[PDB]
Amino acid sequence: IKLLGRSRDFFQQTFSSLSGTERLYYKYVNFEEAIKFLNERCLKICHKFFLQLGQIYHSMGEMSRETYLSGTRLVPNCPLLWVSLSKIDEIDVRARSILDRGLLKNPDDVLFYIAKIQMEIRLGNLDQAELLVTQALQKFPSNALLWVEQIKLFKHGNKSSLKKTIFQDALRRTQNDHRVLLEIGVSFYAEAQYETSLKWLERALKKCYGDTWVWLFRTYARLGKDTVDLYNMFDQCECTPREILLRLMNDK
Amino acid sequence: TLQKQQEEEELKRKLKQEEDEKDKRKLIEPNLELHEDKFLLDLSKFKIYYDNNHGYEWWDTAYL
Amino acid sequence: DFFTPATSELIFARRFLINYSLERSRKRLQKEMERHQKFNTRQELLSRRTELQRMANLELAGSQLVSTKPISAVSLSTDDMVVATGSWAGDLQVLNSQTLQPLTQKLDSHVGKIGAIDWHPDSNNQMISCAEDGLIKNFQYSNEEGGLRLLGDLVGHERRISDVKYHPSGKFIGSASHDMTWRLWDASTHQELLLQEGHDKGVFSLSFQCDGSLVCSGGMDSLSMLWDIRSGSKVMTLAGHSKPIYTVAWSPNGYQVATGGGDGIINVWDIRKRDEGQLNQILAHRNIVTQVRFSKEDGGKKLVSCGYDNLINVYSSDTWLKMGSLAGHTDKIISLDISNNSHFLVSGGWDRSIKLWN
Amino acid sequence: MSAPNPKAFPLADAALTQQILDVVQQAANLRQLKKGANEATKTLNRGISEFIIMAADCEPIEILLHLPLLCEDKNVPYVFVPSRVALGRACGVSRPVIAASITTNDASAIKTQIYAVKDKIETLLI
Amino acid sequence: DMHNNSISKTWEGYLQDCKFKGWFMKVCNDQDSLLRTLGQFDSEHFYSP
């Protein structure tokens, strides 16, 4: 009913009289649904239902950040609760203390740092983001994503020297991880020398996932012509996916 | 048969006592842990200090 | 020993002090007298309890960014409307209290490491800051202007100056540094009235009293040494501490003082009783203690403590029971103050935010 | 001794100084140490340092005096121990050594002793 | 059943002079004789109600 749904509401209603079940159901009710969630959901994890809520109000709009304030205070584990909540409040910053609040409650996890970094990055002052990085990284360091933002920070990170060495260590500490490999190849790309990026790009591909490919075909988009075959490997890497790749390609 | 009346006397007295306790509790509600003893204001020491001084603190009493 | 007189006019100032002192104290003490009359146990028993929840209540609202360094000193102008924030950058600035958005203006000092920064007792347009360099600074905060500007300079500590305070007069200033001397100056003329000696290590911290007569002197030797000003008489001296004192806190009571330092433990030295009611140990945090405050108004009830523990506390003025801790920070906590209205709490630290509390 | 350099901020006393240098020498044997000013400076920029040590008896003191500044920025504990020659011997080198830097490792067997020292260090910095 | 039983650190720090010559575990049934028992070593405040 999914791939068939991908091109059957009722069959899920009788199949319903017959927790990820009512979840995918809610996903179906999307394209209004307010009663569907406020009832079919209210029986029921719940966090996704909060998400979908604040998404609803979000495209609608405050009651969103309200309900975030609800599920958050109810279930303080999935960060994107806060990440969202804040992520609204920031635009209206107070946002930080929201971040920190939820943090100190685990805190000891991973992401909340990453959240806080990116939020600073997004907002500005790369310089503290450096600190936050180095801290959480002292703690964690085998955690890759940290090395991601560590690398992003040299795009305009403007400390030119160490990038080499850092690509070095960012590699070796992390048991060389595809996500980094991408991020390196990018930092080549968004500068120049697109072929340099390739060996990295593919070099990660052998560890595969879409977050690369779009770049891959942007690289070809600067060189190209192997286009057709590798589409097979894409067919192996799995809905309108060709719609997605070609979509994001147009973004650039 | 004295066992019945006796048990009524003991049990009823114990209940009366505990009820007097909790009655004192919600009644005050100095407590104990609350140590509220130190919140209380004794004219005794404060005063007898006061005029005991020559009258102005104990600090500068030297001067006048 | 040496007792050496010199430089009269300060004795004149001391003359001044006396008149200022006795009066307020007298009145003050008298007022305290009044309260004894009223008693009414169950009032306080309720009221205290009430505040407890509010203290348990308090939460971080929004934080901010300020500088890139630890944030060494915060404070509030007496109106509770603005924050003085200096820090290891050597930078100052003044922020909107209730609110925190961004700031009035960020002026960098001429100094690079800032011990503490303090507000004029009345006009509240003026500040003073102790520095790394052995210089002390008077500044003008202009209206809602960003008009942070020199009101003047102060000279002659040869070490870092770890603390400075306005005398409740407002004509008188003090600085405890390292050079093992704590100095008392005229505000107006910007002139030293006093160079005090007597700490076998650096003189770390400083406190006056409401009545302005006593200055408690904290030092780096773990000896909290008390001073009558007008006579320059060491009166009582307090070792409750192993490792150097840091915060010398003073009650509005005027008869009580708190201390904290390397030990990771606070002492309450209650003065008059002086036989043994003496100190009281508060196991305080862990991992040192940085700054300690009594509620400014209200005579002091609440106690506020900032260590490197990364927490911040609330203590009852009498039980001195730990009431609550507030998870405030990612990092260590260099400084704090509190709304004179006792509704807000402002902290700063290593994590470089400046966090506001309910 | 001597009049210690007013520029010298946190300066360990003896009982600590022992525990510090002892941890240094404890490190060099694992060559988890990195010695010398410049090579501390490297370790910081790379961010792999645990804490620092700097001879406070050093000749003109500025030559390392960026190191503190750099350290607050990277946020790493750092001390001054009074006797350089002492530090030098303690590092494995026969000759005055002005500043020296521990480095980071997880499997590092001493890892505790390191930590407990960082603890006792930050306690100084105000 | 100990799964309710819970241990946690209060704190750790320094002390001017130890009043403990040796280490003894014991009971004092109330809080008071317990707190007082601390207070013979002047230790009452170490406990947190």
Q: Where are the domains positioned within chain C?
A: 63-358
Q: Which residue of C has its CA nearest to B56?
A: C26
Give CA–CA dist C13/C232, Å, rounded: 12
A157 φ/ψ angles, rounded to the nearest 5 degrees? -55, -20
**Any C CB within 8 A of A94 CB:** yes
Instruction: Judge: A169–D46 Cβ closer than 8 Å, yes or no.
Output: yes
Q: Which residue, among C274, C280, C282, C329, has the nearest Cα to C304 in the 3D structure? A: C282
C233 φ/ψ angles, rounded to the nearest 5 degrees? -105, 115
Burial zone of A138 (CB within 10 Å; 0-12 exposed, 13-18 middle, 19+ buried): middle
DSSP letter for each residue of C113-177: ---EEEE-SSS-SEEEEE-SSSEEEEEE--TTTT--EEEEEEE--SS---EEEE-SSSSEEEEE-
Give CA–CA dist C216/C312, Å, rounded: 24
DSSP letter for each residue of B14-64: HHHHHHHHHHHHHHH---STT-GGGGS--HHHHHHHHHHTTSS-SSGGG--
CA distances from C135 to C112, C131, C158, C167, C334 (A): 11, 6, 9, 18, 21
Distance from CA of A130 to the nearest CA of C (A): 11
Distance from CA of B37 to the nearest CA of C (A): 9
Subunits with 3+ Cβ pairs within 8 Å of A are C, D
Residues A237, A242, A244, A245: is their CA dihedral positive or negative?
A: positive
Instruction: Judge: E32–B33 Cβ closer than 8 Å, yes or no.
Output: no
Contact at 8 Å (CB) between C282 and C265? yes
Q: Which residue, among C171, C287, C279, C298, has the nearest Cα to E10 in the 3D structure? A: C287
Picking from B36, B38, B57, the nearest residue to C29 by CB comes out as: B57
C11 φ/ψ angles, rounded to the nearest 5 degrees? -60, -45
Burial zone of B3 (CB within 10 Å; 0-12 exposed, 13-18 middle, 19+ buried): exposed
Interior angle at CA C278, CA C273 and CA C283, nearest 5 = 150
CA C46 to chain centre: 30
**Any C CB within 8 A of D6 CB:** yes
Q: Does domain D1-126 have CATH number 3.40.50.880?
A: no
Instruction: Judge: C18–B63 Cβ closer than 8 Å, yes or no.
Output: yes
For the packed helices A163-173 and D37-46, what is the interaxial angle rounded to 10 degrees?
Answer: 60
CA distances from A45 to A33, A112, D28 (A): 18, 20, 52
Q: How does B10-31 read in b/e, with b if 16+ C-beta sit within 10 Å?
A: eeeeeeeeeeeeeeeeeeeeee
Picking from A131, A162, A169, the nearest residue to D75 by CB comes out as: A131
Solved using: cryo-EM
Q: Would you tell me how many other CB atoms lie within 10 Å of the CB of residue E39? A: 13
Instruction: Judge: C308–D123 Cβ closer than 8 Å, yes or no.
Output: yes
Give CA–CA dist C298/C340, Å, rounded: 9
DSSP letter for each residue of A101-139: HHHHHS-SSSHHHHHHHHHHHHHS-HHHHHHHHHHHHHH
Instruction: Judge: B50–C29 Cβ closer than 8 Å, yes or no.
Output: yes
Q: Would you tell me how many other CB atoms lie within 10 Å of the CB of residue C80? A: 20
All residues of chain D having their beta carbon less than 8 Å from the beta carbon of residue A135 are 75
**Any D CB within 8 A of A125 CB:** no
Length of chain D: 126
Instruction: Give every CB contact of residue A230 below 8 A, 6+ residues apart in sequence.
Output: A216
Between strands C94-96 and C116-119, the pairing is unpaired
Number of inter-chain CB pairs under 8 A, C vs D: 20
- D25 HSE (CA, 13 A, CB side): 14
Q: Which residues pair with B44 in a beta bridge?
A: none
Q: How does C94-107 read in b/e, with b if 16+ C-beta sit within 10 Å?
A: bbebeebeebbbbb
- C356 HSE (CA, 13 A, CB side): 27
**Any C CB within 8 A of A134 CB:** no
C215 φ/ψ angles, rounded to the nearest 5 degrees? -120, 110
**Any D CB within 8 A of C250 CB:** no
Q: Which residues pair with C165 in a beta bridge?
A: C174
Q: Which residue, among C339, D29, D46, C179, has the nearest Cα to A170 in the 3D structure? A: D46
All residues of chain A having their beta carbon less than 8 Å from the beta carbon of residue D46 are 162, 165-166, 169
Q: What is the largest CA-CA distance in chain E?
A: 40
Distance from CA of A236 to the nearest CA of D (A): 39
Give CA–CA dist B59/C17, Å, rounded: 13
Return the amino acid letter for D8: A
Distance from CA of C118 to the nearest CA of E (A): 31
Q: How does C33-42 read in b/e, with b if 16+ C-beta sit within 10 Å?
A: eeebeeeeee
All residues of chain A having their beta carbon less than 8 Å from the beta carbon of residue D45 are 161-162
CA A74 to chain centre: 23
Q: Which residue of D has its CA nearest to A166?
A: D46
Contact at 8 Å (CB) between C208 and C215? yes
Instruction: Judge: D104–A169 Cβ closer than 8 Å, yes or no.
Output: no
All residues of chain E having their beta carbon less than 8 Å from the beta carbon of residue B32 are 31-32
Q: Do chains A and B touch (3 or more CB pairs under 8 A)?
A: no
Return the amino acid letter for C197: E
Give CA–CA dist C206/C246, Å, rounded: 9
**Any D CB within 8 A of A169 CB:** yes
All residues of chain C having their beta carbon less than 8 Å from the beta carbon of residue D75 are 350
Secondary-structure breakdown of chain E: helix, strand, coil percentages, each rounded to the nearest 5: 25, 0, 75
All residues of chain D having their beta carbon less than 8 Å from the beta carbon of residue A162 are 45-46
D109 φ/ψ angles, rounded to the nearest 5 degrees? -65, -35
| Tokens 């009221």 -> residue | C47
Return the amino acid letter for C188: S
DSSP state, C310?
A: S
Distance from CA of D116 to the nearest CA of C (A): 12
Output the six-digit token pair for A227: 């286009």
Distance from CA of C63 to the nearest CA of A (A): 5
Interior angle at CA C317, CA C314 and CA C318, nearest 5 = 125
All residues of chain B having their beta carbon less than 8 Å from the beta carbon of residue E32 are 32
Instruction: Give every CB contact of residue C287 below 8 A, 6+ residues apart in sequence.
Output: C264, C307, C308, C309, D119, D123
3-state secondary structure of C50: helix
**Any D CB within 8 A of C308 CB:** yes
Q: Which residues pair with C129 in a beta bridge?
A: C117, C137
Give CA–CA dist C111/C260, Å, rounded: 27
For the packed helices A80-89 and A46-60, what is the interaxial angle rounded to 10 degrees?
Answer: 20
A169 φ/ψ angles, rounded to the nearest 5 degrees? -70, -40
Give CA–CA dist C208/C84, Å, rounded: 20
Burial zone of D20 (CB within 10 Å; 0-12 exposed, 13-18 middle, 19+ buried): buried
Give CA–CA dist C127/C281, Å, rounded: 34
Output the six-digit token pair for C122: 């009345």
| Tokens 């407890």 -> residue | C52
Output the six-digit token pair for A217: 């075909």
Distance from CA of C15 to the nearest CA of B (A): 11
Picking from C240, C262, C286, the nearest residue to E11 by CB comes out as: C286
Output the six-digit token pair for C276: 């043994």
Contact at 8 Å (CB) between C266 and C289? yes
Q: Would you tell me how many other CB atoms lie within 10 Å of the CB of residue C315? A: 24
Give CA–CA dist C180/C161, Å, rounded: 10
Instruction: Judge: C32–B28 Cβ closer than 8 Å, yes or no.
Output: no
Contact at 8 Å (CB) between C264 and C281? no
All residues of chain D having their beta carbon less than 8 Å from the beta carbon of residue C159 are 6
The stretches of chain C forming alpha helices (DSSP H) are: 9-38, 41-57
Phi-psi category of residue D90: left, alpha or beta, with phi > 0 → left and psi -120 to 50 → alpha: alpha
Contact at 8 Å (CB) between D53 and D33? no
- A71 HSE (CA, 13 A, CB side): 26
Give CA–CA dist C176/C196, Å, rounded: 9
